[PDB]
Amino acid sequence: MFISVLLILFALCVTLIPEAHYHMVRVWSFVATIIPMWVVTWMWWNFDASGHGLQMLVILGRSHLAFGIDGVALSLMLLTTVLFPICMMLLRTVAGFMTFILLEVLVLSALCVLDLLGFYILFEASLILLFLLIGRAPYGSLEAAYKIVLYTMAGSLVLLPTLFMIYSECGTTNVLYMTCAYNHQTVLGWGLLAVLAVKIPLMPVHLWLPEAHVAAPTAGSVLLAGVLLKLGGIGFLRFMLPVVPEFCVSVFPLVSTLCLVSFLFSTLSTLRQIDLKKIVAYSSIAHMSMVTLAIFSQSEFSAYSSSFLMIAHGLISPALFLIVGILYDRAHTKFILYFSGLGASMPIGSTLFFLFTLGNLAFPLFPNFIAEVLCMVSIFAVHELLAYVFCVCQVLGAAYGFWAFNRVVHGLPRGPADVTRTEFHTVLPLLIGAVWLGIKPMA
Amino acid sequence: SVEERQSFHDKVNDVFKNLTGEAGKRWARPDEPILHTLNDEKEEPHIFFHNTNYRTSRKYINVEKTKILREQALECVRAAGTARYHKCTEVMKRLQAAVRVASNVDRGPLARKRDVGFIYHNNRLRELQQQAAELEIENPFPAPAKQATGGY
Amino acid sequence: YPGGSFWSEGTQTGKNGFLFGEVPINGQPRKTLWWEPYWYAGFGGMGVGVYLIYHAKPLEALDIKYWAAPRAAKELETEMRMLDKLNERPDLKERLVAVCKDLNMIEDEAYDLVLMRNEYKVKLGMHTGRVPEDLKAIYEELEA
Amino acid sequence: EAKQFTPDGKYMPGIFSKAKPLDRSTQWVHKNPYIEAWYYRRDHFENEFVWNYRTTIEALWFLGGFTAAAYALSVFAFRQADRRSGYPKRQILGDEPAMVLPDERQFY
Amino acid sequence: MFLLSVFFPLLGGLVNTSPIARFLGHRGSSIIAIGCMVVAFISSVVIYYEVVFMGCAVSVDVFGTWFSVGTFHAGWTFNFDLLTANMLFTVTGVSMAVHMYACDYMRQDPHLNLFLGYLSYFTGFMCVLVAADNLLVMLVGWEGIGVCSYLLIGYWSHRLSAVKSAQKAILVNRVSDGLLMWGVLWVWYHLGSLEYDLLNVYSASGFVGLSILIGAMGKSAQILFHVWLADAMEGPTPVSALIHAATLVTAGVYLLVRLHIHDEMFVIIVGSLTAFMAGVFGATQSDLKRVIAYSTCSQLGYMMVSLGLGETGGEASMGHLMTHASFKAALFLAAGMVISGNGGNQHIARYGGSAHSAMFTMLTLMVASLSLIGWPELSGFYSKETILNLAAICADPIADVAHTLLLLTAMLTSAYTTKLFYQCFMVDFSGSSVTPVRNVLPILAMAILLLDIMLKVWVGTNLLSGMLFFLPWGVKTLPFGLMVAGILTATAAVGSERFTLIRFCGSRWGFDQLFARSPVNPIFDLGRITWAIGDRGLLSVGNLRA
Numbered sequence A: 001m002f003i004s005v006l007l008i009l010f011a012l013c014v015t016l017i018p019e020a021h022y023h024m025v026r027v028w029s030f031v032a033t034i035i036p037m038w039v040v041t042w043m044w045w046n047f048d049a050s051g052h053g054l055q056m057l058v059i060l061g062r063s064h065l066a067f068g069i070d071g072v073a074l075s076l077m078l079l080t081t082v083l084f085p086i087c088m089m090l091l092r093t094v095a096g097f098m099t100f101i102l103l104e105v106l107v108l109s110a111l112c113v114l115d116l117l118g119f120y121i122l123f124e125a126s127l128i129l130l131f132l133l134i135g136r137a138p139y140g141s142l143e144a145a146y147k148i149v150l151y152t153m154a155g156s157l158v159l160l161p162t163l164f165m166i167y168s169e170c171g172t173t174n175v176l177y178m179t180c181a182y183n184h185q186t187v188l189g190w191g192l193l194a195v196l197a198v199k200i201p202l203m204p205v206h207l208w209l210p211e212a213h214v215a216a217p218t219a220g221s222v223l224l225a226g227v228l229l230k231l232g233g234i235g236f237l238r239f240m241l242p243v244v245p246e247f248c249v250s251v252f253p254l255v256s257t258l259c260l261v262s263f264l265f266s267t268l269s270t271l272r273q274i275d276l277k278k279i280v281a282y283s284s285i286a287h288m289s290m291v292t293l294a295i296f297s298q299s300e301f302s303a304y305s306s307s308f309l310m311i312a313h314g315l316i317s318p319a320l321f322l323i324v325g326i327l328y329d330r331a332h333t334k335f336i337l338y339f340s341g342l343g344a345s346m347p348i349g350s351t352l353f354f355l356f357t358l359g360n361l362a363f364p365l366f367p368n369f370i371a372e373v374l375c376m377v378s379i380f381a382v383h384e385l386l387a388y389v390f391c392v393c394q395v396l397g398a399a400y401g402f403w404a405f406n407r408v409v410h411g412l413p414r415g416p417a418d419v420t421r422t423e424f425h426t427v428l429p430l431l432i433g434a435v436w437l438g439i440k441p442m443a
Numbered sequence B: 001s002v003e004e005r006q007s008f009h010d011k012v013n014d015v016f017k018n019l020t021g022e023a024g025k026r027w028a029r030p031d032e033p034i035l036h037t038l039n040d041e042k043e044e045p046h047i048f049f050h051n052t053n054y055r056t057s058r059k060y061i062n063v064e065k066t067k068i069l070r071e072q073a074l075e076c077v078r079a080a081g082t083a084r085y086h087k088c089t090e091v092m093k094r095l096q097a098a099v100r101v102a103s104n105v106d107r108g109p110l111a112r113k114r115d116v117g118f119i120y121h122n123n124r125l126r127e128l129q130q131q132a133a134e135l136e137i138e139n140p141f142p143a144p145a146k147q148a149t150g151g152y
Numbered sequence C: 001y002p003g004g005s006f007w008s009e010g011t012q013t014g015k016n017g018f019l020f021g022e023v024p025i026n027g028q029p030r031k032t033l034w035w036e037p038y039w040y041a042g043f044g045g046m047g048v049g050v051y052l053i054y055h056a057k058p059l060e061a062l063d064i065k066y067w068a069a070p071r072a073a074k075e076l077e078t079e080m081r082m083l084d085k086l087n088e089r090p091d092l093k094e095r096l097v098a099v100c101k102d103l104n105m106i107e108d109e110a111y112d113l114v115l116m117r118n119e120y121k122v123k124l125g126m127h128t129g130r131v132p133e134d135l136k137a138i139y140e141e142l143e144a
Numbered sequence D: 001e002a003k004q005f006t007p008d009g010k011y012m013p014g015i016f017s018k019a020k021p022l023d024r025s026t027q028w029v030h031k032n033p034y035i036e037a038w039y040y041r042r043d044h045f046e047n048e049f050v051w052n053y054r055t056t057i058e059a060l061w062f063l064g065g066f067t068a069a070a071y072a073l074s075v076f077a078f079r080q081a082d083r084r085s086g087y088p089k090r091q092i093l094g095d096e097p098a099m100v101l102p103d104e105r106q107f108y
Numbered sequence E: 001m002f003l004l005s006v007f008f009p010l011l012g013g014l015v016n017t018s019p020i021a022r023f024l025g026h027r028g029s030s031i032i033a034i035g036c037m038v039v040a041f042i043s044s045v046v047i048y049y050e051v052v053f054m055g056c057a058v059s060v061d062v063f064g065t066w067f068s069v070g071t072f073h074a075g076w077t078f079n080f081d082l083l084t085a086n087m088l089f090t091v092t093g094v095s096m097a098v099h100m101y102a103c104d105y106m107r108q109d110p111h112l113n114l115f116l117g118y119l120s121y122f123t124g125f126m127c128v129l130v131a132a133d134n135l136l137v138m139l140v141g142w143e144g145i146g147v148c149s150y151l152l153i154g155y156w157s158h159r160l161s162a163v164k165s166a167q168k169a170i171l172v173n174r175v176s177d178g179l180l181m182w183g184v185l186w187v188w189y190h191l192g193s194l195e196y197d198l199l200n201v202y203s204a205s206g207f208v209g210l211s212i213l214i215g216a217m218g219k220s221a222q223i224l225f226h227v228w229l230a231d232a233m234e235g236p237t238p239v240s241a242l243i244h245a246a247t248l249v250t251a252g253v254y255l256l257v258r259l260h261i262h263d264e265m266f267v268i269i270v271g272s273l274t275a276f277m278a279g280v281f282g283a284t285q286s287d288l289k290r291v292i293a294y295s296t297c298s299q300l301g302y303m304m305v306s307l308g309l310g311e312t313g314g315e316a317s318m319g320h321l322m323t324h325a326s327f328k329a330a331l332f333l334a335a336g337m338v339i340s341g342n343g344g345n346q347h348i349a350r351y352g353g354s355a356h357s358a359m360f361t362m363l364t365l366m367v368a369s370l371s372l373i374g375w376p377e378l379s380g381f382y383s384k385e386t387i388l389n390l391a392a393i394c395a396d397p398i399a400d401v402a403h404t405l406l407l408l409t410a411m412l413t414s415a416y417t418t419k420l421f422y423q424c425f426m427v428d429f430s431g432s433s434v435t436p437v438r439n440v441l442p443i444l445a446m447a448i449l450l451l452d453i454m455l456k457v458w459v460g461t462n463l464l465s466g467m468l469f470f471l472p473w474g475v476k477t478l479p480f481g482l483m484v485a486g487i488l489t490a491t492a493a494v495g496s497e498r499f500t501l502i503r504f505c506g507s508r509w510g511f512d513q514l515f516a517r518s519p520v521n522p523i524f525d526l527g528r529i530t531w532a533i534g535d536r537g538l539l540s541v542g543n544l545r546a
């Protein structure tokens, strides 16, 4: 807590640096995100895996805002602290540095909060930052920014009275006493489903993602894909399943059909896309549908497998966004028809593209393979057909993945030259994390 | 009554307030659960968290039992060679029973009961054969198997 | 082949391309980019820290499966001989099957009931009376 | 034939120089007008939606049809799981008061 | 010696694709690849003699545990038993000669060391596949050979048809990979483990054998999955030899022989229909490599039926796999030498005479062709006659039709293989390019596979060779007469006037054309519906103009 105050105050000192010292501004904003990565690694060192489920607790009196660490929050916090310095390497202005610093404060505090009102306050305080990040004046899109902000606001406004309903019902929004009291679970369950089915892209409230994740800059796309979608999953695992479990059983056919149609229809839409960033953007919806069904199965080790799929997606899809961002930065287009023969002109970039293509399709020696196997073990244990639907549709994911790769990488060599040292080192931590988590993830 | 429930809650709060433990023991890996006659154990949060820790301990121990028995059964089968059909049925049965306990105890609210031996299926086939005999019609089902796997 | 044989000298000297598009200027060593010391310190100190978490934490502190592996082994030792004795006592086995019938279990699930003597439901059901009173006795003469 | 570096490093911008400097926009693509038009049209394809015969029929049989198929399959899987677990009929949303949430203290 | 058969081709691939190869060049990388295969073959020979003959299986815990969540436990463990030793000997011995051939065949390619590294990776993932003791490390090998097959089929990436052939192989195999994954889920759920030695099934739930059979039909290119196999000729000749002999197509048959959890009706029907279909397909082709590809599909059908017959049939199935790899790789290498001697032409109407090839290439084609058609007391005679005689005494009435289909297939095979020899050498010359290849490395590559053909006659694959299943002389010597009938018909070069049957068979029954619109175009159109009518239409929420 004292450490967190010191890290925030060190991060906020970027504004006071005079702008004529360019080197100092770059180094200060990069170190301001490097330090929380070290602190979260130390928190992993301090964790007792044979101890209590909630460790390193702190509660700030009668102000809500109570905090604690479990395994899902700790893995997601480690992933966020990895992803934020890479975002710092892709920005050039103090406005970008400050927006991403404020976003990192809000994400890190939202991932480990234990109060529902605290979760509401901390998460969607990032709405105006996302609006300004997506609708930036010369190269953004105001339509996309309006869509993402309005969908998130709609879901949050459905949740807010139900939050206050359980608060008047039992006397607290602390999740440890909300899980032990008697509450009207249908109303609160519908409010929580309303927020987290927009955060996780679940059809029909999913149309904001294709616009926002493409109109964003490369750093914004890395953040939005790798981090902000998983707040819906940790919302399911931390707040909704412990507090309204009767609802979570009774809504299972509806959540199940939403997940199945989201998976199938989003995979079918990904095949007709002609923009590389839109191809990468749609593929995330099917993965999150598998995550949601694995969470809702509650069957074998469902929290473990679903968290592991969230980590595998958060490693693999930001790297695909990084490669598309390199192509866009040095060729000024994201259109497939302008790219051919990238193997001959960018051999290192095409090799990285192929490896992350194989990772996104859940091939072995990548963490997505272990993730999808364990998620389908959790789904299979409820019924065999709910697993069969995901199993037989694997040709549809590989079709779009290999079609996009084969169209842009082979053929007549036209396009930009190979990657620089900076682009390679933006990609590199994700590759090392993927090789480790896909070969020896546990000990 | 309400007064007795209130006095029990006060006693539980006093006990869990003045609780300590040392010498190599982790709290939240308790040796025994707290036995109660409460309707809805979540009425008393300390008892609910204590029994939650005990139940987590048991799930992980059962997983470990499955691994130890799988190593033993592998040793038996690989030593036996082609004689494995009559030599290592008992250890295969014990491994399958341990997997059954590891899956079916504290299973969650949605997963079906896992039969590692096809034992529920063949038990059902026995009962359906017996019912079709008294019904005096042809059995539309297969006849029950004596053993389905290398264990059961 | 150059030189008239497979075993001659090679025929290329110089750069076979430029790695990362970097061309040496006047033979000088390459200038370090602004992020390189901080990148290597941050990500290397994360990688070494993750390695030390996996290879220098106590095993019980690293993973709960190391806490439960020795406790499962002794329970399995005192359960293997219980299962051995059950294969020699038909009266104990038929009493166990009667308890299995009372607990909505089938005859093949007799081995399972021995293996779940420490479960939360069995201890709480012995306390409440949902579990038949004979099961404790059967456990007692199977351990003896 | 530009010179953007001194012999000891030291990048030069070449703002007033005659020779064209190599920079970030050197490999930007030359835009084909028809490709840009087609991508613009596909970007705004929601203006081309119309409730004609084919749109209504395909939105009924494929979208609503497969959504109903997936709901029926989900209910089938839920009921079969509850039967193969020893449970009675369980209360889904809009199904009258019944059993939800099995008790861990109970043998089914 | 045991881990040297698996690690060390992977090491050769890692060396030849990394920036170490920037210091070796083509000349150094060829040396590295050939040596890294010679060591692995020597290790596999030691493993073969220890496990097959002296009967001592070896289990190695290699890299600890892979992942273990709940009761799902996957470990990095190998086990070297009889089937594993058989497969390792076959794979490494074929891949050594294919590497020695490819170091000379692809000499004028600009990226030679990349090609050699891809070949070594493909071999190493095959070794990982057969050396695994559980299902998940097997899936590592399965998808590894799938990926390396994609990289090698579409090697000449500037050609669009090669790229589309590689994508087609990936997609057709991805359907069966999905079914195989669901079958692994069934197996683990209802038996409790993933290791092969704990998977003893007497009576399972039907979906197990069916879904594992579909997953095997994908890799072994059976009926309704064979469509990728013919288009995989876009890759270079060493790729085709290694795909059709030792890697990839033999993996599904190995999996079914290992598990033995099938239901025999599906297996027998699929195998016999595949054998007859690929026999009539290869009889009506003029592309030299496509005839050999269809003969591979036909022999995989034979092995499928055999493993349907029983445990003895499973042993005969493994035996035919082992003897098939040697003469199939020899056939592809000889065909590559004939193609290179004729200026790259692959049409058998533009061959003839004995000037475009070496004496050893013609001898290799002749001997491998005689082993394939079941000429007496050669290598294929023993295994093929064993499968045919086991099919003639099966008590299943379904196997009666299967045996007739196999005998018709045997006559068709002796027809088109004799046609391949006749068009290539016996007729008058009708090409215009005579550049015969007489280099040392491809000739030694062919001589090694001919030595293995002799070895299979001298030392059998299993104990079935020499066992007499008691059949009358009429039933026993009929396949010899069918071989002679094929030879006489093909040398007479006779044809029929029923041109509509000829163009129905030569167009390969229209499977690709019917698949181009029965799933494929509907998938594209349903994507159009889900995007335009759903995302932009029914679910789209517009703006409020003011």
Ligand SMILES: CCCCCCCCCCCCCCCCCC(=O)O[C@@H](COC(=O)CCCCCCCCCCCCCCC)COP(=O)(O)OCC[N+](C)(C)C
Binding pocket: A044, A047, A048, A049, A050, A051, A052, A053, A070, A071, A072, A074, A075, A076, A078, A079, A082, A303, A304, A307, A308, A311, A428, A429, A430, A432, A433, A434, A437, A441, A442, A443, B056, C043, C044, C046, C047, C062, C063, C064
């Ligand atoms: C719900 C459980 C959490 C699992 C989430 C999945 C994690 C993804 C990766 C799997 C790694 C498994 C690690 C196992 C040993 C590590 C310590 C451990 O035990 O895990 C911790 C938590 O583990 C973690 O935090 C793992 C961190 C994984 C995140 C990795 C991604 C970030 C790295 C990015 C790439 C960096 C490259 C940099 C180099 C250049 C606690 O989990 P449980 O054992 O379930 O807790 C026990 C429960 N109870 C206390 C109640 C008894």
Ligand SMILES: CCCCCCCCCCCCCCCCCCCC(=O)O[C@H](COC(=O)CCCCCCCCCCCCCC)COP(=O)(O)OCCN
Binding pocket: A365, A439, A440, E007, E008, E010, E011, E061, E062, E063, E064, E065
């Ligand atoms: C882009 C895709 C590229 C594909 C690459 C090829 C395909 C790879 C597929 C499988 C990858 C698995 C790699 C695992 C890495 C190490 C994991 C184990 C970590 C560890 O500490 O384990 C110890 C390390 O031992 C050792 O590592 C042995 C000790 C050193 C002696 C041998 C040295 C290795 C020589 C290898 C040559 C080249 C082979 C290429 C694969 C072994 O002990 P344990 O703790 O597991 O205990 C159990 C038995 N004692």
